[PDB]
Amino acid sequence: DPAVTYYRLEEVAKRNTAEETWMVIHGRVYDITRFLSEHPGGEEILLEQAGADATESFEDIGHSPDAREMLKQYYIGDVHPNDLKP
Numbered sequence: 001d002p003a004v005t006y007y008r009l010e011e012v013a014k015r016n017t018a019e020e021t022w023m024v025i026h027g028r029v030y031d032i033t034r035f036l037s038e039h040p041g042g043e044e045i046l047l048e049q050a051g052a053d054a055t056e057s058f059e060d061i062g063h064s065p066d067a068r069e070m071l072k073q074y075y076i077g078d079v080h081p082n083d084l085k086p
């Protein structure tokens with residue numbers, strides 16, 4: 001409500017290369033550009049889903065509670081409600 005920044009999925013889709021990498025997880029946008037080289041699962045698997053909603057893959061992997069906490073550092077905004085799916 002207050003100072004929440006909103007992005008359309010169309011904007012997120014443009015950040016799909018190693019130069020500026022964004023990813024959507026549970027309706028929120030994360031800029032993981034600087035996390036690529038630090039990801040224990042490697043950088044390739046992240047680049048393969050860059051610029052898109054990676055929620056299913058993130059959950060399917062079974063990430064730990066510590067992995068979820070790491071997300072906060074990369075949070076940059078929410079996906080506009082009109083772009084969220086049923």
Ligand code: HEM
Pocket residue numbers: 023030032039040041042045046049054057058061063064066067068070071
């Ligand atoms: C951008 C948010 C993400 C964060 C912060 C993150 C963080 C992490 C962390 C901390 C681990 C180590 C877990 C452990 O100690 O067991 C890990 C492992 C892994 N991550 Fe991610 N991850 C993210 C997204 C993804 C995505 C989108 C995929 C793609 C399917 C992925 C695939 C993996 C895989 C395959 C492993 C290895 C697990 C194993 O050892 O079997 N991650 N991730």
